[PDB]
Amino acid sequence: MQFLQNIPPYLFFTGKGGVGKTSISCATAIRLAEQGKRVLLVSTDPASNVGQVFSQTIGNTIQAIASVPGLSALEIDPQAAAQQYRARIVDPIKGVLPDDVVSSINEQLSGACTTEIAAFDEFTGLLTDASLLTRFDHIIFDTAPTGHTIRLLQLPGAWSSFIDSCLGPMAGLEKQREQYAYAVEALSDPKRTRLVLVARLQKSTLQEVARTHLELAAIGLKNQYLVINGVLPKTEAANDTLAAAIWEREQEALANLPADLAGLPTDTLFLQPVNMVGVSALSRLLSTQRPDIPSLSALVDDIARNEHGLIMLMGKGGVGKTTMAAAIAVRLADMGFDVHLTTSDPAAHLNNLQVSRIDPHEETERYRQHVLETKGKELDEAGKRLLEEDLRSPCTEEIAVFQAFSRVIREAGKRFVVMDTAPTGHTLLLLDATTPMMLLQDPERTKVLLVTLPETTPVLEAANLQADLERAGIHPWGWIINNSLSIADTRSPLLRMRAQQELPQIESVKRQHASRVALVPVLASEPTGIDKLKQLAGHHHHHH
Ligand SMILES: Nc1ncnc2c1ncn2[C@@H]1O[C@H](COP(=O)(O)OP(=O)(O)NP(=O)(O)O)[C@@H](O)[C@H]1O
Numbered sequence: 001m002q003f004l005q006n007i008p009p010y011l012f013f014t015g016k017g018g019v020g021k022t023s024i025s026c027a028t029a030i031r032l033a034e035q036g037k038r039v040l041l042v043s044t045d046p047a048s049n050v051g052q053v054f055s056q057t058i059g060n061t062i063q064a065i066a067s068v069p070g071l072s073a074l075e076i077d078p079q080a081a082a083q084q085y086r087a088r089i090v091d092p093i094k095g096v097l098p099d100d101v102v103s104s105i106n107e108q109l110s111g112a113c114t115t116e117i118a119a120f121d122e123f124t125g126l127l128t129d130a131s132l133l134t135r136f137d138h139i140i141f142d143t144a145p146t147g148h149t150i151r152l153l154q155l156p157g158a159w160s161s162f163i164d165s166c167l168g169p170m171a172g173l174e175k176q177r178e179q180y181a182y183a184v185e186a187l188s189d190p191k192r193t194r195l196v197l198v199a200r201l202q203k204s205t206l207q208e209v210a211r212t213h214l215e216l217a218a219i220g221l222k223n224q225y226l227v228i229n230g231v232l233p234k235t236e237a238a239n240d241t242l243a244a245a246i247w248e249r250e251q252e253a254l255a256n257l258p259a260d261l262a263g264l265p266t267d268t269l270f271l272q273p274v275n276m277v278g279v280s281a282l283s284r285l286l287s288t289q290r291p292d293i294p295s296l297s298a299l300v301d302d303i304a305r306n307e308h309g310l311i312m313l314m315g316k317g318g319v320g321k322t323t324m325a326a327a328i329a330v331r332l333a334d335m336g337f338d339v340h341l342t343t344s345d346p347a348a349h350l351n352n353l354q355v356s357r358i359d360p361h362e363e364t365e366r367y368r369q370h371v372l373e374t375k376g377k378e379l380d381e382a383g384k385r386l387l388e389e390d391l392r393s394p395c396t397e398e399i400a401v402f403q404a405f406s407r408v409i410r411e412a413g414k415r416f417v418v419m420d421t422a423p424t425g426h427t428l429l430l431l432d433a434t435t436p437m438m439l440l441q442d443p444e445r446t447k448v449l450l451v452t453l454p455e456t457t458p459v460l461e462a463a464n465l466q467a468d469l470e471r472a473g474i475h476p477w478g479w480i481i482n483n484s485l486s487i488a489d490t491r492s493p494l495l496r497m498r499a500q501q502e503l504p505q506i507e508s509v510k511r512q513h514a515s516r517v518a519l520v521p522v523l524a525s526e527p528t529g530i531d532k533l534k535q536l537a538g539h540h541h542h543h544h
């Protein structure tokens with residue numbers, strides 16, 4: 001593998017939740033160890049599972065991984081780090097300012113952005129400690145900071161300006177500006193740091209990666225490698241029609257890699273039978289080769305009961321929000337109700353369903369513009385740039401799009417309104433303090449659906465979203481598990497072994513996460529036409 005040749009002291013892996021960053025990290029950690037290299041593995045995942053995969057406990061201290069000499073691990077809890085980053089700001093004014101104030105400020109430091117800043121604070125600590133390179137040849141992280149987080153800490157304005165929004169965490173950095181600059185310097189030095197983009201052979205995921213690559217490159221990380229994981233081996237597309245549909249779809253994308261990623265050194269890893277759980281299984285990865293859950297139609301029949309309501313589909317990026325939102329809207333309309341679908345991405349398209357397409361790009365720009373008259377007013381040029389970078393945050397689009405959607409939320413009364421994306425609980429809370437919070441919290445009026453995948457990480461990320469939404473008083477009405485192989489028509493041995501891997505995930509969702517659940521299958525054909533869109537739903541036998 002190219003990504004394993006001549007690794008510098010710092011190696012970071014980046015990619016969406018569940019692409020296999022941690023798995024690949026662990027795998028590489030061993031590979032390097034057995035070549036006689038001293039390796040430090042840094043787990044940075046919310047609820048780390050690296051200790052488990054290595055059958056031991058790890059902690060905020062460097063410990064040896066007895067099951068593989070030459071290797072050691074260290075866990076950096078992001079949640080714990082964020083908690084203490086917030087406390088480091090709030091505790092000092094606790095008791096000097098009123099409670100409702102300390103309360104608001106605390107919320108201002110409970111979003112994804114604070115977590116990102118705090119993680120960067122730990123990364124910097126590691127990156128700026130030479131001694132480590134005295135004890136190790138390689139320090140591997142299973143996640144990487146985003147371009148946004150890097151831009152923010154490299155702005156002159158972040159140090160010389162103050163703003164009357166997610167800039168709150170910035171006053172939490174206690175290290176000198178020089179260390180943050182040193183870190184960024186190390187991340188941009190191809191001699192010290194290699195960035196590995198992890199993706200899948202899915203037209204869509206590649207689009208996101210190509211994007212991350214440009215952002216990180218412009219910033220300075222030009223030592224990048226592409227690792228396409230979970231690829232389906234042709235020696236499987238034989239016999240079973242499903243596997244065949246897939247294998248092509250990938251060979252298709254694989255062959256049409258977005259332009260930007262083309263010039264990137266690339267390696268592909270194979271879809272494995274069982275989800276790794278040991279040195280043996282992990283090592284394999286680097287080589288060269290039905291549940292009792294109702295159909296989506298069942299969820300829709302119960303959403304149809306009231307004959308009206310706001311249907312909001314939520315979840316992480318790529319889990320299929322827009323597709324579930326179109327399937328539901330299409331089904332509701334064919335059941336005879338006036339349905340108004342709202343999307344934030346170009347799709348397509350009886351006269352019972354009307355579709356509103358909003359362009360997040362222009363919505364975001366109207367919003368950014370609006371905030372630059374309000375706040376930018378007395379800021380100096382350096383500060384305006386800090387403000388424009390904060391408005392480059394994930395939630396800026398999130399907020400802007402939600403305000404565009406709100407334009408129609410009014411009709412949730414006469415009919416059904418289906419949306420394919422929503423702001424986080426934290427963001428809803430922020431907007432509330434400044435906007436139909438009451439409507440959203442009402443269980444009769446709104447029905448929030450959480451879309452996720454039958455995989456370990458996507459379920460955890462979804463659980464966390466629900467937890468956040470719950471702090472805002474919104475309780476998801478049901479969960480939709482997408483791309484399921486269990487409920488899939490397949491004679492393909494690997495896909496069957498794969499479908500069997502999903503069971504505990506799907507079981508978790510029904511037993512511990514959702515009031516209601518829907519199981520959708522891996523279509524094996526892009527649900528582009530309302531034809532295949534109607535196929536996702538399945539069927540619900542009428543009863544009394
Ligand atoms: N059940 C499915 N079977 C096969 N393909 C699917 C399924 N659900 C979604 N997809 C495909 O996966 C892609 C990504 O899902 P999509 O519905 O766009 O995501 P989303 O979560 O709205 N995206 P984003 O708004 O970008 O986070 C689409 O191109 C789909 O056709």
Ligand SMILES: Nc1ncnc2c1ncn2[C@@H]1O[C@H](COP(=O)(O)OP(=O)(O)O)[C@@H](O)[C@H]1O
Binds near residue numbers: 018023274
């Ligand atoms: N090529 C692959 N084939 C089969 N399973 C994989 C592959 N890559 C990862 N997985 C399995 O998938 C989940 C995806 O997870 P993971 O590495 O934890 O990463 P992350 O969330 O950091 O991207 C795990 O349950 C894992 O053991």
Ligand SMILES: [Cl-]
Binds near residue numbers: 110166426
């Ligand atoms: Cl945030």
Ligand SMILES: [Cl-]
Binds near residue numbers: 109114115
């Ligand atoms: Cl935040």
Ligand SMILES: [Cl-]
Binds near residue numbers: 113114
């Ligand atoms: Cl941020």
Ligand SMILES: [Cl-]
Binds near residue numbers: 301541542543
């Ligand atoms: Cl019925």
Ligand SMILES: [Mg+2]
Binds near residue numbers: 018022
């Ligand atoms: Mg991970």
Ligand SMILES: [Mg+2]
Binds near residue numbers: 321322344345
């Ligand atoms: Mg979408």
